[PDB]
Amino acid sequence: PTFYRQELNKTIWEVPERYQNLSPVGSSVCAAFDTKTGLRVAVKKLSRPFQSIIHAKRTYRELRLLKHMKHENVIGLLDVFTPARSLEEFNDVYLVTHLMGADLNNIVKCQKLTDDHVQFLIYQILRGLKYIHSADIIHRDLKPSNLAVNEDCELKILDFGLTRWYRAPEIMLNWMHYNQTVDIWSVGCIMAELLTGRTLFPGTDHIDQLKLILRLVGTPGAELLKKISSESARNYIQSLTQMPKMNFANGANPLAVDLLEKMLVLDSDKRITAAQALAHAYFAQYHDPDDEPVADPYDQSFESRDLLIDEWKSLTYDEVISFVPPP
Ligand SMILES: O=C(NCCN1CCOCC1)c1ccc2c(c1)C(=O)c1ccc(Nc3ccc(F)c(NC(=O)c4ccccc4)c3)cc1CC2
Ligand SMILES: CCCCCCCCO[C@@H]1O[C@H](CO)[C@@H](O)[C@H](O)[C@H]1O
Numbered sequence: 001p002t003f004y005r006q007e008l009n010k011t012i013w014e015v016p017e018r019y020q021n022l023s024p025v026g027s028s029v030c031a032a033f034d035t036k037t038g039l040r041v042a043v044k045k046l047s048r049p050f051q052s053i054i055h056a057k058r059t060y061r062e063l064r065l066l067k068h069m070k071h072e073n074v075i076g077l078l079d080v081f082t083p084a085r086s087l088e089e090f091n092d093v094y095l096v097t098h099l100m101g102a103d104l105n106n107i108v109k110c111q112k113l114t115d116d117h118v119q120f121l122i123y124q125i126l127r128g129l130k131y132i133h134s135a136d137i138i139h140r141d142l143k144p145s146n147l148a149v150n151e152d153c154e155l156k157i158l159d160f161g162l163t164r165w166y167r168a169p170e171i172m173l174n175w176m177h178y179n180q181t182v183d184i185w186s187v188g189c190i191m192a193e194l195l196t197g198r199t200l201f202p203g204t205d206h207i208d209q210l211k212l213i214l215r216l217v218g219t220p221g222a223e224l225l226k227k228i229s230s231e232s233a234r235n236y237i238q239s240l241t242q243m244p245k246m247n248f249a250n251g252a253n254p255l256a257v258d259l260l261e262k263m264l265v266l267d268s269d270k271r272i273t274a275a276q277a278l279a280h281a282y283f284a285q286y287h288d289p290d291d292e293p294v295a296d297p298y299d300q301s302f303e304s305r306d307l308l309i310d311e312w313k314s315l316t317y318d319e320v321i322s323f324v325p326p327p
């Protein structure tokens, strides 16, 4: 197609004519109208995609991830393009996705949602996670600003498989062997916040974050302590004034409360999974076991490769070129 060129976010964006009305939304992404499909779309121009091995692999990962994900509650690739006509001139990558029009913070505006609205919202998050997790992909930094939401409150998860208020405690402690339920922790934090209008653990800093979590969920149990090898870390922990798991309750729906108690567990092996959460009574209104799909297997064999820049770049080119838009 025919491209045109335009100054946006401090650079020259060169895009096909189909895409019009480009205007910045954030850290880079523009909102636009795809005149060809009649959809509002987000167009993301990658910064310095092939600068280094690390940038190149990250560019490739993003494209691979977005190509793979085909689910209503997960952002997916509507188009990818480049101004370049060949490999050698290939230096820019643009990704095009649905434009939802707001993130979850924009929907909450520090206000309590009704229990029914929380249901619908959390349901969709979990439905997206089941899918993501079924491909052995973990978000790791799930939060309201990564959840894109339209007027109808249909929700899509952004930026999976790559501010500490939604983070699993083990990630903050650089545990290194993360299980999928790190995202579940995040889910409970978001859920509590939808229901109260207030951040569940608004830590002032790293150590304060861990403190607020400890105070609510209580000090680590015996089984959990068994799984920590450092004597000094156990020493610290068990020398603290010992601390009960406070009552989560304290007019919320008791089913919400129960679900939250099963998400917000220090021990990640004991947290409820996305699929178990979707079957929890809290979601009786929305749960449909025959429309909570899994993903096709995802070829992640690239993650373990150490390749040269030119190969990362060529692999990316090849994916731009093979790209087939959805229905
Ligand atoms: O339309 C918005 N307008 C803001 C200005 N106002 C105008 C009108 O009034 C209200 C809004 C708006 C405001 C906020 C948001 C979106 C849109 C949104 O749809 C939206 C859509 C996409 C997006 N990010 C995005 C875009 C393209 C991508 F390729 C990615 N990449 C990833 O998600 C990703 C996935 C896997 C690995 C790595 C990255 C992410 C980020 C947002 C941010 C939330
Ligand atoms: C504030 C201090 C509490 C930190 C306790 C974190 C417990 C995390 O849970 C742990 O997750 C690891 C996966 O990352 C698993 O390997 C361990 O089996 C599991 O116990």
Ligand SMILES: CCCCCCCCO[C@@H]1O[C@H](CO)[C@@H](O)[C@H](O)[C@H]1O
Pocket (backbone or CB within 6 Å): 173, 174, 175, 176, 210, 227, 228, 229, 230, 233, 236
């Ligand atoms: C207030 C925060 C103090 C909590 C101390 C947690 C330190 C956990 O340390 C973790 O233990 C795991 C199992 O032994 C190891 O696999 C990880 O390498 C290590 O990070």
